[PDB]
Amino acid sequence: HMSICTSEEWQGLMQFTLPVRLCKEIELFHFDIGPFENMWPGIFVYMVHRSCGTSCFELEKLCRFIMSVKKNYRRVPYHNWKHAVTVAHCMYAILQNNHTLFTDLERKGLLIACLCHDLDHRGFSNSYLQKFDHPLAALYSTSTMEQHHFSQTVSILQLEGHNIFSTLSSSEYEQVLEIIRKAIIATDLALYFGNRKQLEEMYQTGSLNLNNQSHRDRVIGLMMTACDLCSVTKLWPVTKLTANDIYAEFWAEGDEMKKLGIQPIPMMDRDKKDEVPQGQLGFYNAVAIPCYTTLTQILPPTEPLLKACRDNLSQWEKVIRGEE
Ligand SMILES: Cc1ccc2c(c1)nc(CCc1nc(C)c3ncccn13)n2-c1ccccc1
Ligand SMILES: [Mg+2]
Ligand SMILES: [Zn+2]
């Protein structure tokens, strides 16, 4: 049921050298992979190399894996190859800027987990899948897509020469799977509002504890949320576009619901192009600012993320108030 990569593709991944100019820009939180499609896979490699050592992974295995993952994203406007790497890139810049909070076991687990986080996304919501009445939602009742995404990740590693976590002991092995499992589960937005509520809480009562695992787990989940939406932390011209991608998905989900006589919720209704700016402002305030605000608080070096969200937010304000 899986999809691998022609020997051509992966071997040329090893040949790839990131051009000297993009080296300082890549370290920036607000860096935009967008202009560099040819490089996306090779950019993920370089970050692996720079994060966790030149060879935690045997090149060929990694490259095979990376390219096989590519081959398992669909060609939809938003939850596709570009987004997985964009998410990857933000985890990278997070991990780098928090150099000693995390373990090699986490940092490679997390970079992999973002790459895989939306594997084989079809371009439908959990809602749409459960609300009527898909085999994937027939299988996994809550967090429909995110479990599929992890099982997809799972089947990629279980392949011939793809198990880049092989050399690890079986204890360390099924442990990163546990990092990656929960990592991917966390990007179910539904679950995030609770997680943030709880973390909000812990930080106040001087109670949040990076030693405790299900505290670690929560801290990370928040990092996964924050990565996932980092669209909203890129320079405005990049944030305008990455939004256009997002609505072409939603509105394509709205259409499949109109085709049935059913009003889609307005975020997915193309008959509301002008309601969007307002809706975006709402999203920044109800979901985004909290996410980055609470991330900044727990991880101060990740402040530039909040700085940039804020910048976009007021850009979106300006669009509503009629100027820009
Ligand atoms: C008329 C309308 C109405 C609401 C809308 C909307 C358009 N649009 C959005 C949010 C759209 C959006 N932008 C990025 C970057 C996203 N990421 C993940 C999920 C949604 N995202 N809401 C919204 C606002 C507030 C909360 C949740 C969703
Ligand atoms: Mg997802
Ligand atoms: Zn995502």
Swiss-Prot record:
Belongs to the cyclic nucleotide phosphodiesterase family. Abundant in the putamen and caudate nucleus regions of brain and testis, moderately expressed in the thyroid gland, pituitary gland, thalamus and cerebellum. It comes from the Eukaryota. The tandem GAF domains bind cAMP, and regulate enzyme activity. The binding of cAMP stimulates enzyme activity. Composed of a C-terminal catalytic domain containing two divalent metal sites and an N-terminal regulatory domain which contains one cyclic nucleotide-binding region. Changing residue 118 to N: Reduces activity 1000-fold. It is linked to Dyskinesia, limb and orofacial, infantile-onset: An autosomal recessive, early-onset hyperkinetic movement disorder characterized by axial hypotonia, dyskinesia of the limbs and trunk, orofacial dyskinesia, drooling, and dysarthria. The severity of the hyperkinesis is variable. Striatal degeneration, autosomal dominant 2: An autosomal dominant disorder characterized by striatal degeneration and dysfunction of basal ganglia, resulting in hyperkinesis. A divalent metal cation 1 binds at residues 83, 117-118, 228. Homodimer. A divalent metal cation 2 binds at residue 118. Plays a role in signal transduction by regulating the intracellular concentration of cyclic nucleotides. Can hydrolyze both cAMP and cGMP, but has higher affinity for cAMP and is more efficient with cAMP as substrate. May play a critical role in regulating cAMP and cGMP levels in the striatum, a region of the brain that contributes to the control of movement and cognition. Residues 6-323 form the PDEase domain. 3',5'-cyclic GMP binds at residues 79, 280. This is cAMP and cAMP-inhibited cGMP 3',5'-cyclic phosphodiesterase 10A. The active site is at 79 (proton donor). 3',5'-cyclic AMP binds at residues 79, 280. The gene is PDE10A. It is found in: Cytoplasm, Cytosol.
